[PDB]
Design a protein around this ligand. Structure first.
Ligand SMILES: [Cl-]
Length: 333
């Protein structure tokens, strides 16, 4: 049997009958929630519990979109950004505390994971080459992201690096085209690939960049066997879960339907295809997996969270100690 699975989304803050029906198919392995599905933690918790009454094996993910959810949805813990964490003598400890807090709360509201950490590099073109600003300090990024992952793992959560092989040097010439990073594989290896290389052995999963690196492969990274098999699983020895990029095309189009795109993604080596914001495309992709008679990738359940839903997480000693450490570092309050 070919292996693969579909991760989809829903429209609202609760399940429709149509939602319930699509979630029952075994080829659906995951559901991702966004700010549009989130009112507050207790609602998120009950939405997750309702999904698990249908499918206890479903992987439930939140795209917090760069601390996005925590900002306008009341009641989630506000955590410092990595650049604020970096400017401390105990930055590693603080990054651990942040990974631990985020993963503890996300699992307390019934989710398995948050897609984190970001491994993309910030390149200041205003600075000149060689400086840790134009290059983006990839070793420091890998150090602090590795600490953040330790915190996530300590709370029971599997970690997903994004966006492989790194989109920090990609340039969006316009709105229609897929961004490109036209540097050689040697240049990429010594810069944006570094955090992925450093952490491939620690990460449980990766998400690909929606970028063409035309000197390496003509295809976006999520569809390239050279990127996913030769470099990621081969050179980086990565044995974790590979998510596709979003198989719904709304900004940078590619040809074919979600059916051919999920086929191409699994062909390149993805374990789980994502179809967001497009239920019609999700049903086309599901139909494709049904005709392929796929079974779930043996890797997939690595992403299941070892924590669990609970309402008392914030009164626990570890939670208070973690916040007290961020407070002592002047990062919160
Ligand atoms: Cl745990």
């Amino acid at each position: 049997h070919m292996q693969g699975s579909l991760m989809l989304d829903i429209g609202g803050t609760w399940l429709t009958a149509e939602d319930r029906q699509i979630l029952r198919h075994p080829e659906v392995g995951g559901l991702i929630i966004f700010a549009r599905n989130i009112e507050h933690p207790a609602q998120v918790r009950e939405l997750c519990a309702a999904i698990r009454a249908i499918r206890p094996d479903l992987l439930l993910a939140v795209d917090q979109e760069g601390g996005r959810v925590q900002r306008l949805r009341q009641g989630f813990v506000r955590l410092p950004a990595m650049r604020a964490i970096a400017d401390n003598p105990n930055a590693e400890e603080l990054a651990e505390h942040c990974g631990w807090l985020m993963a503890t709360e996300v699992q307390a509201v019934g989710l398995d994971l948050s897609f984190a950490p970001v491994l993309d590099l910030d390149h200041q073109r205003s600075a000149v080459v060689g400086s840790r600003a134009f290059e983006g300090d990839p070793e420091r990024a890998a150090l602090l992201a590795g600490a953040f992952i330790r915190g996530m793992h300590a709370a029971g959560m599997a970690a997903t690096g994004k966006h492989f092989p790194g989109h920090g040097w990609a340039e969006a010439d316009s709105h229609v085209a897929i961004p490109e990073d036209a540097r050689s594989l040697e240049e990429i290896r010594r810069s944006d690939l570094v955090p992925f290389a450093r952490l491939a052995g620690q990460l449980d999963a990766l998400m690909p960049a929606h970028v063409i690196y035309p000197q390496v492969d003509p295809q976006p990274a999520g569809f390239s066997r050279r990127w996913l098999q030769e470099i990621l699983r081969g050179e980086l020895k990565f044995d974790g879960v590979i998510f596709s990029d979003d198989l719904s095309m709304a900004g940078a189009h590619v040809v074919g339907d979600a059916a051919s795109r999920i086929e191409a993604a699994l062909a390149a080596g993805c374990d789980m295809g994502l179809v967001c914001n497009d239920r019609a495309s999700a049903e086309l992709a599901l139909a494709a997996l049904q005709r392929l008679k796929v079974t779930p990738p043996s890797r997939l359940q690595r992403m299941r969270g070892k924590g669990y839903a609970n309402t008392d997480y914030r009164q626990q000693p570890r939670w208070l100690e973690a916040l007290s450490a961020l407070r002592a570092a002047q990062l919160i309050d």
